[PDB]
């Protein structure tokens, strides 16, 4: 793995368009990005996929899974935070 | 939140 922190811009895809690559493995709590010449890879898991919204960086996805070879032409799969934020809120409130 | 003190350069 690299010593210094890396970054990469990449486009979000629709789950329909993403299913063309992954078929039924693409679930509702997942969001795809990439297939643009860059790819998240082993060691990146758990990290952020952030999008700027109204001037602030917001957590849209969590690095989750993808191509076993980290192919830069296949979409990477991230946990869709929008589908999990209510659980995050409940957990923080109770603990 | 979401506004770094050191701006990212993309």
């Amino acid at each position: 793995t690299p010593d210094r922190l890396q970054q990469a811009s990449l486009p979000l895809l629709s789950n329909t368009n993403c299913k063309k690559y992954w078929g039924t493995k693409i679930k509702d709590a997942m969001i795809c990005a990439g297939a643009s010449g860059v790819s998240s890879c082993m060691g990146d898991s758990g990290g952020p996929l952030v999008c700027k919204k109204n001037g602030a960086w917001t957590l849209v996805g969590i690095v989750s899974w993808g191509s076993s070879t980290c192919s830069t032409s296949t979409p990477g799969v991230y946990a869709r935070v929008t589908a999990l934020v209510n659980w995050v809120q409940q957990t923080l409130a109770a603990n | 939140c979401g506004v770094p003190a050191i701006q990212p350069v993309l």
Binding site: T1, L10, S39, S45, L49, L59, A83, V88 | -
Partner: protein
């Protein structure tokens, strides 16, 4: 990240590194406040692992980083390891992070937020650059 570029040091202040007791980086994570880190459930974090904040160059000895201990691991009960669905785990720090210019929180979206296909976003990390 394959085909990425080196970040401006300190420009992604919420990015943390999950390292085992051996000092080996195995996953990334994001600070959502001074006491909680969000990461992936498949990372398999235990309380013996450490959260490292404020780090840029993992090979450097002169960075003022914060090595934070983990009090608890909250694996989303809906996580399905067979399908990798609902892949999220929250980490409660036993020692709160000290926010500074290089350590701060990322925002969480509202459950109804819309992020359109074609939108360019950013992903960061210390994963493999070549596979």
């Amino acid at each position: 990240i394959v085909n990425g570029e080196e970040a401006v040091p300190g420009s992604w202040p919420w990015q943390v590194s999950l390292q085992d007791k051996t000092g080996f980086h195995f996953c990334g994570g994001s600070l959502i406040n001074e006491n909680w880190v969000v990461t992936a459930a498949h990372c398999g974090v235990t309380t013996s692992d450490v959260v490292v904040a404020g780090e840029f160059d993992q090979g450097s000895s002169s960075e003022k980083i914060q090595k934070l201990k983990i009090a608890k691991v909250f694996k989303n009960s809906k996580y399905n390891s067979l399908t990798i669905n609902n892949d999220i785990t929250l980490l409660k720090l036993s020692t709160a992070a000290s926010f500074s210019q290089t350590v701060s929180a990322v925002c969480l979206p509202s459950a109804s937020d819309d992020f359109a296909a074609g939108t360019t976003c950013v992903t960061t990390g210390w994963g493999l650059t070549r596979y």
